[PDB]
Each structure stands twice: as structure tokens, then as C-alpha cells.
Amino acid sequence: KIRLYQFLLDLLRSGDMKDSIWWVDKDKGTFQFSSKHKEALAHRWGIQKGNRKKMTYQKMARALRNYGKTGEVKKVKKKLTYQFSGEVLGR
DNA sequence: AATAAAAGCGGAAGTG
DNA sequence: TCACTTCCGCTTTTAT
Numbered sequence: 222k223i224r225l226y227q228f229l230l231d232l233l234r235s236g237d238m239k240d241s242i243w244w245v246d247k248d249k250g251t252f253q254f255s256s257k258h259k260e261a262l263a264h265r266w267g268i269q270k271g272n273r274k275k276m277t278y279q280k281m282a283r284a285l286r287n288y289g290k291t292g293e294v295k296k297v298k299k300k301l302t303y304q305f306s307g308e309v310l311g312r
Numbered sequence: 313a314a315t316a317a318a319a320g321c322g323g324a325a326g327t328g
Numbered sequence: 329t330c331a332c333t334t335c336c337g338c339t340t341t342t343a344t
Contacts, residue, residue, distance in 0.1 A: 284332055
């Protein structure tokens with residue numbers, strides 16, 4: 222199946238929803254959601270998953286936090302900002 | 313000098 | 329057993 226962090230990495234590399242999410246330092250692996258448009262991106266994630274209820278950014282960010290222990294995606298001390306690990310990106 | 317709003321947090325039970 | 333999903337309540341950051 223597809224994992225949340227890959228769903229995000231896909232959009233970022235696609236530019237498919239540049240209005241909702243965007244790199245901050247593509248080299249460092251940091252990215253940021255739009256305060257106004259993040260809910261739309263969260264909705265699309267719930268639909269790709271087919272979940273019973275519609276997906277919200279709150280529930281999505283709740284999922285992201287579980288990646289902290291495993292390292293895929295860590296929270297940056299910047300509003301709506303996260304960071305992919307090197308392994309997720311490449312080498 | 314306080315607020316309101318938004319963001320961020322995580323335990324617990326639940327779902328394909 | 330996974331990878332979240334859903335719910336609920338509390339705390340922190342931010343904007344004014």
C-alpha cells in the first residue's frame with residue numbers, strides 16, 4: 222500500500238498541488254503546508270485512502286507525529302513545517 | 313497585559 | 329501484525 226509520507230513526497234515532486242504544499246529547503250528536505258489550503262490536501266489524502274470519514278489536517282498531522290519515532294518525517298520548530306529524512310529522499 | 317485563534321500534542325480504541 | 333484513523337482533551341505558539 223501507499224504510505225502517508227510517500228503521498229506527500231509525490232505531490233511535492235509533482236507540483237500537483239503547489240497551492241497547498243511546497244518545499245522550504247528542497248535540499249534540506251523541509252516542506253510546508255498552506256495554512257489556508259492544507260485542508261484541501263488533507264481531503265485528497267483521505268479520498269485516496271477511501272476512509273469512512275473525510276480526512277482533516279488535524280487527523281493527518283496526528284498521523285505524521287507517529288513518524289517521529291521511526292524518523293521518516295520530523296516536525297520542525299516552524300509553523301506547519303516538516304522535514305523528510307535522507308533515506309526517504311535518496312542517500 | 314491580556315486574549316482569541318491557530319497550531320501542536322498524545323493516549324486510547326478502532327479500522328482495512 | 330501494520331499503518332494509520334478516529335476521538336477526545338489539554339497545552340503551546342502565534343497573531344492582535
